[PDB]
Structure formats: structure tokens, C-alpha cells
Amino acid sequence: GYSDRVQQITLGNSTITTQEAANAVVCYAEWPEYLPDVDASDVNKTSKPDTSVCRFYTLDSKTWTTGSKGWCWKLPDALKDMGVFGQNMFFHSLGRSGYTVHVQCNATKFHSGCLLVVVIPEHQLASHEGGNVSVKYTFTHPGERGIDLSSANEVGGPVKDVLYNMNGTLLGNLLIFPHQFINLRTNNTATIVIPYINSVPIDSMTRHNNVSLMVIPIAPLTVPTGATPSLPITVTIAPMCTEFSGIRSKSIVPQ
Amino acid sequence: TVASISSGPKHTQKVPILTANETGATMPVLPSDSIETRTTYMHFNGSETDVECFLGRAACVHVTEIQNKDATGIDNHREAKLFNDWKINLSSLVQLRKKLELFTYVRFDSEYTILATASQPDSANYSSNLVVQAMYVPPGAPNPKEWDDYTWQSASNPSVFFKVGDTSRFSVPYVGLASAYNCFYDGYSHDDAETQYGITVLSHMGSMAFRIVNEHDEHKTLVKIRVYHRAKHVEAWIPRAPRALPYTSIGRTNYPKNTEPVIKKRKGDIKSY
Amino acid sequence: GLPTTTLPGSGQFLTTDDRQSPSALPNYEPTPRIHIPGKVHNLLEIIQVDTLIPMNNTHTKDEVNSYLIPLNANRQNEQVFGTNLFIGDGVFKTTLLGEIVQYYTHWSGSLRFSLMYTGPALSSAKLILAYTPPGARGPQDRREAMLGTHVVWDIGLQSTIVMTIPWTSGVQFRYTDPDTYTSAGFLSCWYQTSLILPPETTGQVYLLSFISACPDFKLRLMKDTQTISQTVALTE
Amino acid sequence: GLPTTTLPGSGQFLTTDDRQSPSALPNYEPTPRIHIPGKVHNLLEIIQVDTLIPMNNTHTKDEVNSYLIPLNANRQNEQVFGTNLFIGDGVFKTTLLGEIVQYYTHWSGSLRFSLMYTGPALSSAKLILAYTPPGARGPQDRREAMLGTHVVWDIGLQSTIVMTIPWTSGVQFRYTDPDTYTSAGFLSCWYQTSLILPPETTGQVYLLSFISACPDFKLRLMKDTQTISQTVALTE
Amino acid sequence: GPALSSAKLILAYTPPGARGPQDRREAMLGTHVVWDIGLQSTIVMTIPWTSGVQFRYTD
Amino acid sequence: INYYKDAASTSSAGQSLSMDPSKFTEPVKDLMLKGAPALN
Amino acid sequence: INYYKDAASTSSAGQSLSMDPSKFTEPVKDLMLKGAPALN
Numbered sequence A: 001g002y003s004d005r006v007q008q009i010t011l012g013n014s015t016i017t018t019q020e021a022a023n024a025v026v027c028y029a030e031w032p033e034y035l036p037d038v039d040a041s042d043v044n045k046t047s048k049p050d051t052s053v054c055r056f057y058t059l060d061s062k063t064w065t066t067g068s069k070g071w072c073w074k075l076p077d078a079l080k081d082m083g084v085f086g087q088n089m090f091f092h093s094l095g096r097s098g099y100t101v102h103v104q105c106n107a108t109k110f111h112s113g114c115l116l117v118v119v120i121p122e123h124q125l126a127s128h129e130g131g132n133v134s135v136k137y138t139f140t141h142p143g144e145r146g147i148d149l150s151s152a153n154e155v156g157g158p159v160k161d162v163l164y165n166m167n168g169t170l171l172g173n174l175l176i177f178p179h180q181f182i183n184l185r186t187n188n189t190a191t192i193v194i195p196y197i198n199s200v201p202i203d204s205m206t207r208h209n210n211v212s213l214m215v216i217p218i219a220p221l222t223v224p225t226g227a228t229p230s231l232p233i234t235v236t237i238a239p240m241c242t243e244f245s246g247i248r249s250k251s252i253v254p255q
Numbered sequence B: 001t002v003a004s005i006s007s008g009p010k011h012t013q014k015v016p017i018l019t020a021n022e023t024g025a026t027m028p029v030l031p032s033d034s035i036e037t038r039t040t041y042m043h044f045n046g047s048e049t050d051v052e053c054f055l056g057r058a059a060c061v062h063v064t065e066i067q068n069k070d071a072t073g074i075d076n077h078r079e080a081k082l083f084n085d086w087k088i089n090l091s092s093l094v095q096l097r098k099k100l101e102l103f104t105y106v107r108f109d110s111e112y113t114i115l116a117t118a119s120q121p122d123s124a125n126y127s128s129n130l131v132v133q134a135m136y137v138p139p140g141a142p143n144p145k146e147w148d149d150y151t152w153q154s155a156s157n158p159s160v161f162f163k164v165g166d167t168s169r170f171s172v173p174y175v176g177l178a179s180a181y182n183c184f185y186d187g188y189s190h191d192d193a194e195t196q197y198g199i200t201v202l203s204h205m206g207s208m209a210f211r212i213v214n215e216h217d218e219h220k221t222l223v224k225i226r227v228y229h230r231a232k233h234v235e236a237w238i239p240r241a242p243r244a245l246p247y248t249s250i251g252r253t254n255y256p257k258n259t260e261p262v263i264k265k266r267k268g269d270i271k272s273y
Numbered sequence C, D: 001g002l003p004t005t006t007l008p009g010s011g012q013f014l015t016t017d018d019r020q021s022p023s024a025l026p027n028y029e030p031t032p033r034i035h036i037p038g039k040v041h042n043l044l045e046i047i048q049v050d051t052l053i054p055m056n057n058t059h060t061k062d063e064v065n066s067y068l069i070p071l072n073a074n075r076q077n078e079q080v081f082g083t084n085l086f087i088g089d090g091v092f093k094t095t096l097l098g099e100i101v102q103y104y105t106h107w108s109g110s111l112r113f114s115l116m117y118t119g120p121a122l123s124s125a126k127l128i129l130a131y132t133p134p135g136a137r138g139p140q141d142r143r144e145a146m147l148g149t150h151v152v153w154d155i156g157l158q159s160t161i162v163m164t165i166p167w168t169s170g171v172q173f174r175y176t177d178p179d180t181y182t183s184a185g186f187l188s189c190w191y192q193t194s195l196i197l198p199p200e201t202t203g204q205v206y207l208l209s210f211i212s213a214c215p216d217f218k219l220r221l222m223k224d225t226q227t228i229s230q231t232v233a234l235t236e
Numbered sequence E: 001g002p003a004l005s006s007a008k009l010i011l012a013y014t015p016p017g018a019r020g021p022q023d024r025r026e027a028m029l030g031t032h033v034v035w036d037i038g039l040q041s042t043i044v045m046t047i048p049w050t051s052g053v054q055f056r057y058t059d
Numbered sequence F, G: 001i002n003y004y005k006d007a008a009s010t011s012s013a014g015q016s017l018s019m020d021p022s023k024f025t026e027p028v029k030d031l032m033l034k035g036a037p038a039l040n
């Protein structure tokens, strides 16, 4: 009586149940694991807070309306302030982590709409100015708020044009990245497990984000007659196999 | 190898063509799941689509130019093209760039070919064979100031001398600092409020300096350098969506404003053929 | 001293030749490789992942909407969409498949075309997708369409339908770039019965459509893509 | 006559290639080698010998005094010295380590920083040395400093203290030449308790400081040093 | 609720030492279960014994 | 025959002949069998 | 393959792979053990 459909994920002191899942994606078919010695470089023993950092943090909720263009969060940024995960983050020189991402959106059998939930490794954004204008730090570190693709261009911020993925590629091809759809008629959640993907064994958690999670409405939300025209979307994310190394004074970052 | 097996009528409870794309999978459906097929063999291996093959041919990565002329009274050799210099990079020209950016991280050895041809714009006489010197000036090492500085001694820095009209060829191991080169980097060099964003900060690989060894003749001679790059021993990770809009800058993803629609509009209906 | 003779071609530079060269950095030790998920070995590996087709090409500036094929409730017998199968051009051209095919001169193989339905769960519909092999015109009505490769799709719990365009061909390779002799057919879709919405519901519903290549597929003779060009070298 | 083809690169002179050549002096017999103590095989052998760092760089012309770090009796909580760790520049630059690092482009490894105390034997002191890994600012007070790599040094019979800056890094190599992304941290030193001089004694005492590389160390990609240049050829 | 409705609730247990949470952000950092209302009508949350002292008074 | 000492100086590599699209086409956590229902 | 008769004409030598810093780092007459007191 197991269905692909019902699932439970327990991680730390927190549990999620979905009764309307559509399997789960594990990026590149690899599950998060700690850093092996053969791959290690820094000689420091690392710190593995385990259950105090590897639990589920639910970010603040978004509201899908008929005019929504899509939202974008960066990792580990989105979690920069969650509990002890965040403290560890500002206090060590280097850290590394994988995540379980669970995006939630329920409706009824009269609604229609379909969101794309995708994880993009190394999502370098484009400046809407063109040329070689850079995208300032603050703009690519929105924190739990994430970036709202239907917000206005700002100065020093990225471009927010959806048919171009914020980088000069077409929305249609985002499907080459680990992703899952939430089609109100099928699905009510999306779950993706992200292994740590980098060109170095461990890195800085503040100067470099290693994935952007993106939720994009593709088939517009259509509510039943005289229904309220909107649904909330909630994102809950859990660091998994986290390791921190090179402890010290506590980083100070712009803004 | 069979490309298609033989398959006949079906009346089952087992439907391989109904799936749920919401899952993120592309189910491996074949012609024989939905029509009646006959056996056929592949006769093919997919040899020429190997990434080593795809990135393994020489591509032009840079065209520069230097001239041989009397430096007498020149206050700025660099500025007179008495010796140009190139900030090594692999995204200045776009044919090869779009190919590499199909991947996120890439690792390979490089084979460089350098072709140098001469031009004599101002009606001339006898051209004495010019010899070009190509130095590798990695970051931290004195960079040439005049076309005949102590720098050109290049006692510790690899340099090649070849003749204009000829070609020079040598191969450099993968010089990246990390395990792969980042084709993309969503980071900064530090948490500064105004530091540049992108890979520009990861791309540091220094520059390469060219000059003519010959002193000047009576006329002036323009030498134009073309650098070709071939990846050998390629390793590529994490495929990405291909580049759709035009490029504007080395190292940023930025596209131009008021660009044009990249998807061709139908001449007719959705229903049109 | 061993006697030699040099042949025609000596001194040429062929960008496609593969030989040994002296290393400029004798004895240098590259950084160790660490493990990174996601390694690609063949472009054939990636063109089997499906991506969305902007089938609804009828707009005037690129929009998220050209990915949506609309469906109308209560129409009978009528046609949902049509397209030829020049995978290197037209709707296909910006898709990952289209985009890679363009790096090669010839292609052969089967294509997988699937449609995922997004209408309310309490609605229902039966569509017919038809592949018309080279030699006939794009079908003009379902009767015409239904006599070639087709699948009646019944919209249900299982949200997507995967249609295969089996390789139908005399010549074993076709050019990517639109050739006549080498042309592959048409793909059309019609109401089999009709879309029906539940009460309290209204308007258009949309289908999303994807394209990917079957394991069947072959691409050969690499060349340059018409999809990218430039007028001056970029700088930093 | 055997048929050949010459490739691109024929006739080039690459200063780094390694091939055979005819000897100009056929059959000549070199002088026998005799034994000489001191043979060097690797530059890695010598950068492990420690040499003095002109830490006290604050003078205006080079002097023996910039090797001396002064210490004041009776100060509490305060800071003895500070420096970043750009081994290819600044204090490090003229040291043997600094001087060799400059012949290479990349370095990786642990550094050994030691301090030898020279104050009267009847005095005493407790100092804290702190290494701050990349990512934070140079510490501004001991509280800040003590939260990173540190050693409380107790001045005793044993005159020197050897602090190691363990390799703390994401990227496995850093440039010698000052790079940001690639930067290595800061090194600071503060009074842990304070220097105390015996009676009949007065003034400043000094610490000498050395730097050498751990056996850990790697240097790669040789290049030319900014530390030497010239304007005309020398003559006899 | 009617069978054709849907809902997602979070239940949170806050162990001794902090105040009753004032908003979900605060609540979600302690023991919690996201409950998805479905066919299966009930959700069972456990308040695991979190305690220094091994017994507590009822009163 | 390599004429040169360093590995970078050797010619192009030889075909992976690796080929495994499943990391890209089927990264699902619970295995899907073709023919069995997608969602149970 | 050497094509030439004299030894000077051969290519570069091959890595010492000797490496022993102790003549430079520890030329002390009585052996010092790390961990034992420097001066007894």
C-alpha cells in the first residue's frame, strides 16, 4: 500500500509528511555524503553539529497569484539566519552541505496551475544593465526573502526576466537541471535532495552560493469560480551532512 | 547492437506510454512501445559526440596585433603596439565559448597554435624575416614595459620564438587552482559590498606577451597574431541550458537590453505546418 | 643522418588533427581531481533528457506563454496544433535537442514527443496525436490524420503521454538543416472526443509539450551552429 | 628515403623544451667530481630552514632594527604586532621563503612562524599568538584574536616558540602574488599577562621572529621574480 | 473538513526554556511535523520526553 | 609512442565509451519501472 | 634513444627525488628529539 504518493522525511527533530508527492529527485543521482580524506585539503578537523543543523527550516511563505513571475532563493544564503546553522556559517572560515528541499502548494480538484521547481548549480546571474555591469553582493544575497522575479529592476541588482533564467538561457531548457513540477491536478509538493557540488572540496559559505532553488509558475494559476484568486507556496529546506571548518572570529558581511 | 527489436500487436494492462512528467524523469520510451517494429541494428557508436571530440579541435580564441617600427621617441611602447599583451582568457570569442558553457566545470590540457602573418600597408621594399617572441607572464612576474626590457630575458618563464608566417605550437597542462575550471561562479572574491561578481575573479591565469625580436627596417610592418586553442584530455561536469541571447562581456552572463525575440514566430497559426 | 622526403601538406595547420606537442611547463603538477556529481561523457547522454518546446510560437516577443498549448472545452473533431518535423528549425530550434542537433550535420533516430496535461483534476479529455511520414501533406482533418502513426491519449491520473516518432526513412540519415529530400513528416493533434470542464470552472486549460531523443539516435559530422555569432571580440 | 610530413611548430625555439644536441667538443673529458659538503637537490629542501622576518618594517631606511619586535614591561591586554599573510609581499618578501615563493606562481602548505625571546633571564612574560583564517578581519583585540588558531606562549628556559599556520583553505592552491579570493588570513600577537622585568633592569626587550615552510608545502608553475631587474647589460 | 478541501498545518513542540512561540518562524525551530491533510485523516505528533530532571510534578 | 615526457603533451584522449544518461534522465529516488503506473 | 655519442648531448636529467633537508635544518652535533626539552 506504499504509494509513490505518500512520504515521510524525518531529519533531526523535524518531520514532514506529504500525502500527494510525485516521487523525489536526487540530483545527478547522488545523495549528500561527508568529505572524504582522499579529497581533503585543509588540515583542520571539521565540526559536524549533526542534528542541531540538519533539521528542516521553513522559510516565510510566498503568494502565487495570476500575475506571479517566479521566485529565486540561493543556498546557503536562504538559511544564513536559521538557528545554529546560521551561526556556524558566520563563525567558520569554510563549511560544506547538501540539502533536502521540500516545496509545498495545495489547492483543490477544481484549480489548475503548474510550477517548475528546479535546482541550478552555480547560477551566475546577469546584470539588467548589459555590458559588464556587475550584480552587487546584497542583490545576490536576498536571505530568506529570496528574489521576486516580478519585482522591479533595481540598480546593482540582477535582471528578473523569466524567459531567460536570469542569465541568457531559455526557460524551456531548465529541465536539463534536477527539477520536479507541482501540477495542482497531480502533485502538491516537490522534493529534491541536493548533494554538495563544487570544484573545491569545501568553500566559503558567504562569498559563494552553490545552488539557486527556483520556483516558477508555468501554467498560470486558475482558480474555480469566485474562488480567491491566489494560493500560498511554502519552501522548507534542511541542511544535510553539514560540516564546518576553520573556526574563528565571525564574519562581517556587507549590508 | 539492436536499434529496434521486432514487436507485434499489444492489448495489455501494462502501458509504458502513460507517465507522470511531474516526477522529473524522462522515461525511456521506444518506438516499439507504441507501434509494431521489425529488427534493425545501430551500425553506429556515438564516437563523434564524445566530449573529448566535441571540445577537441582548435578554435580561434584571440587575434591581436603588434608592429615593428622605430621606437625612437615612443613614450609608450605598449601603446604603440611595439609589443601588445593579452589577458589570457577563453571567452573573448564566442564560437568556442557557447560550446564550453554547455557544462559548469571543465578540466583539460590546452594545446595552443599561434599563427602570425605580416602586412605592409605603406608601399614597401624588402621585408626582412621577423621573429616573434611569445612570453608567458603569469601573475606575480614582471610585466614588460618596453619592447626590449630585462623581462624579455625570460630566464624562468616559458617563451617560444618562431617566424612570422610560420606557426608555433606547444601544450600547457591544466593550470587551474581548483579541481576544474569554473565555467560559472555565483560568488565574489570576498564579502565586499562593491567587489566584482562572476568568474573574472577566478580567472586569473595571467597574460601572454608578444613582441618582434627584430630591430626596425626602413618601412613599418604590421604583424597580426591569431591564437588557437584545442582542449585535450577533457572532463566536463553538470550540463546546463545552452546560451540563447548574445554575449556582452568576458565573464559575465549579461545579455544586451532590447535584444530580439530568440524564438522564431510562426507565419500562421498554432495549427500551421 | 637518416634520408627523408617531405610530402604535400608539410607545414599545414589543420584545426582537427591530433598530435603530440612539447609541454611549456615541464614538470608541473596539476591539482588533484576531487569527485563532482554530474559528469557528462557524450552529448548523446544529454539529448535524452526532455525539455519543453515553445510550440505556441504565435506571440510577438518571447514569452512564457509560447510554451503553453491551449485547449478549448466542448470543441469536437477539431485540431489542437500542427508543426513539421524540421528538428533544426522552427519550434524545435531552441530546445536542448534542437540546440545540439545544430552542432552536427546529419541525424538519424527516433524522437520522443510527450504532452503533460495541466487542467483541473475533475475535467477529462481524449486527444489523438498523429505522426505523418514524409510523402503526404500535413493532415487537414483527423480522418486524414488518423491514417498514419497515432496514439489516442485518455487524460487521467497519469498526467503525461509519450508519443514516439519512429524513424521512418528511405535514406538512413537526414540533414539537421531543412532539406526537402531529407524531410521527416508532420506532427498534428486533434480532439478525439473533447475537453470537458467540471462545474464552477472555466476558460482554457493548457498542455505542456516536451521533446527528447530515443536511445536510437545518431548525430554525425560536427559543424558550427547558426545559433550564435558576434561582431567584435568581447572584453572584460 | 622515408616519407615525412612536418607539423605546425616546426622550427620554433621553446625555452622550456628538453632535447638532445650535438656536442661542440667531441670527446672531451670533464674534471673528476670530488666530494663537497652541502649539495642541494630541491628548493623544497632549503625553504624549511628558518630565517628572520623584518617584522618591524616601520623604519625609513633598511636597518638591523626592523628585525627586532619590541616588548614593553607592564602593559596588559595590548597588541604586540600584526601582519597579513601574503607570503610573497610585505614583511615576508625578503625572507628566504618569501624570496623563493616568488619564483613560483602557486603555493599550498603549512607555514612555521616562531618567536625567540631575548629579554634578561630574570624577566617573565606570557604572550598569545593568533592565526585568523581567511574570512574575518585582522583581529582588533585579544578577545577577537583568541577565537581562532592561537598558542599561549610562556617565556621560559626554552627560548623559542614555534607556531604553525595550518593550511586552512577551500581552494587547494593560493597565488604567491597578492590575490583576494586566494588570501590566507592574518597573524597577530598580544600580551596574555604581561612582560615583567627584574629589578635593576630597564627598557624594551625584543623578540626575534623567523619563518620557514612545513614539510607539507608545495610550490608550482615557475615564473620570473619581481625581485630583480636591470637596465643595461653588466660588463667586467 | 469536506473531502474536496486541502490544508497543510505545522504542529510544534517547544521544549522548556524558551517562551511559547510567537510566529511560525519561531515555532518551526523546535520539534515540529508538517501535516498534509489527506486521505489519512489523523496525524500523530509525539512530544518526546525532553528533560534534565527525570521526573516532573503533575501539579 | 610518446616522444615527450609530460602527460599534457600527449594527443587527444580516446572515447569514453562510458555513456549513462540515467543520472540526467532518471534521477528519481524510488525507481520507476516502464509499464508500471507512474503514481501508485 | 641517444642519437649522439657524448654525454653532454643528452637531454635534461630526471628528478633527484633525493631530498634531505637535515643537512640544512638540523646540523646539530647532539641529536635533538622533538618533544624532548631543547636544553637539558
Ligand SMILES: Cc1cc(CCCCCCCOc2ccc(C3=N[C@@H](C)CO3)cc2)on1
Pocket: B088, B089, B090, B091, B100, B106, B110, B134, B135, B136, B158, B159, B160, B170, B172, B175, B181, B182, B183, B203, B205, B208, C024
Ligand atoms: C610561450 C608560452 C605561452 C604560454 C601560455 C601558457 C598557457 C596558460 C593559459 C592557461 C589556460 O587558460 C585558461 C583560461 C581560462 C579558462 C576558462 N575560463 C572559463 C570560461 C572556462 O575555462 C581555461 C584556461 O605558455 N608558454
